[PDB]
Amino acid sequence: GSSGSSGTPLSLTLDHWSEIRSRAHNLSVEIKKGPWRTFCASEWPTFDVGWPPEGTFDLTVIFEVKAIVFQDGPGSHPDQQPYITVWQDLVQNSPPWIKSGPSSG
C-alpha cells in the first residue's frame, strides 16, 4: 500500500511542468505555472472537499475538486477545468516521476 512522508505532488508536478503542459497540449488546453500553483495553493484546498495544500494524486480527491470546478452556474471553473483535468490525467497515467516502484515482471 502507498504510505510515505516525502516529496509532494504540487512540487512533483511543478517540477515536471513540462509534462503538465504536455498533457494540456494532448488535451488541447492551456495552463500556466503561476495559477496552477495558486489554484493548488489555497483554491482547491479551499473548496471544502478534502484537498491538501500540498496536493494529492487521489482521483477521489481530484473528482471532488473537479466536481465543484465542473459544477453548474458561474461557480464552475473553466480556468481550472483544464487544470484539474490534467491532475486527473496524472492519476490515471501515473508517471514514473510520480509513482516509483520495481514492479516485478
CA distances from 52 to 42, 87, 95 (A): 9, 14, 20
Question: Residue 10 has which C-alpha cell?
Answer: 504540487
Question: Residue 99 has which C-alpha cell?
Answer: 509513482
Technique employed here was: NMR
Structural gaps in the chain: residues followed by a C–N separation over 2.5 Å: none
Quick check: helix, strand or coil at residue 48?
coil
Residue 54 has what DSSP assignment? S
Helix axes 59-69, 81-92, angle to 10 degrees: 160
CATH fold label, 1-105: DNA polymerase; domain 1 (1.10.150)
Give the chain's end-to-end CA distance (angstroms, integer): 18
CA 61 to centroid of chain Cα atoms: 10
**Residue tagged 473528482 (cell numbers):** 63
Rounded Cα distance between 71 and 74, Å, is: 8
